[PDB]
């Protein structure tokens, strides 16, 4: 459906974003000069459920996939509901090299 896609670099200790689709920039209001190099958590805000955030934190430290419903905020401060699925991408030696994210605005 209508979705956006990013790639995070697991070879760096805090999974910075290294690629983002045109949709991600158009959806969030942020340019590449403010997204690339940074961890995705900047989209979070006051009403983001810390329990759900922690489901992602654990799934990333454990190298598993994960799906969560998060409240995110565009650059202009307005909120929206981000259905987010993170998938680990391993090398042949079983080590996680990248994390890929599909984000869907499910505000409906
Ligand atoms: C974010 N999308 C997103 C995409 C990928 C590929 C990854 C790996 C993470 C995200 N996040 C979350 C963020 O990077 C982090 O994993 C979590 O905040 C949990 O860890 P912390 O240390 O912050 O407790 C995404 N977060 C969002 O809020 N919106 C997304 O689109």
């Amino acid at each position: 459906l209508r979705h956006t896609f990013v790639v995070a670099d697991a070879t760096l200790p805090d999974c910075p974003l290294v690629y983002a689709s045109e949709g991600f920039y158009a959806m969030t209001g942020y340019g590449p000069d403010e997204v690339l190099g940074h961890n995705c958590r900047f989209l979070q805000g006051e009403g983001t459920d810390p329990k759900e955030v922690q489901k992602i934190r654990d799934a990333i430290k454990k190298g598993e996939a994960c799906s969560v419903r998060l409240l995110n905020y565009r650059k202009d401060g307005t909120p929206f509901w981000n259905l987010l699925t993170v998938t680990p991408i391993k090398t042949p030696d079983g080590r996680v090299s990248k994390f890929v994210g599909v984000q869907v605005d499910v505000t409906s």
Side-chain angles (χ1 to χ4, degrees), residues 6-8 14-15 17 24 39-44 48 53-54 56-57 60 70-72 82 84 86-87 99-103:
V6 297
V7 179
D14 200 28
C15 285
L17 293 185
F24 192 87
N39 184 274
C40 183
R41 59 173 73 89
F42 64 93
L43 292 175
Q44 287 162 31
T48 318
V53 166
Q54 202 192 36
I56 335 174
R57 194 187 304 140
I60 290 176
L70 282 188
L71 185 67
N72 280 174
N82 185 359
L84 153 79
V86 176
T87 298
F99 274 103
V100 297
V102 177
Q103 294 81 208

Side-chain angles (χ1 to χ4, degrees), residues 78-101:
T78 52
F80 73 92
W81 284 93
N82 185 359
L83 168 63
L84 153 79
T85 306
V86 176
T87 298
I89 298 312
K90 301 178 177 158
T91 42
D93 64 355
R95 300 175 57 170
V96 176
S97 164
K98 312 275 167 282
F99 274 103
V100 297

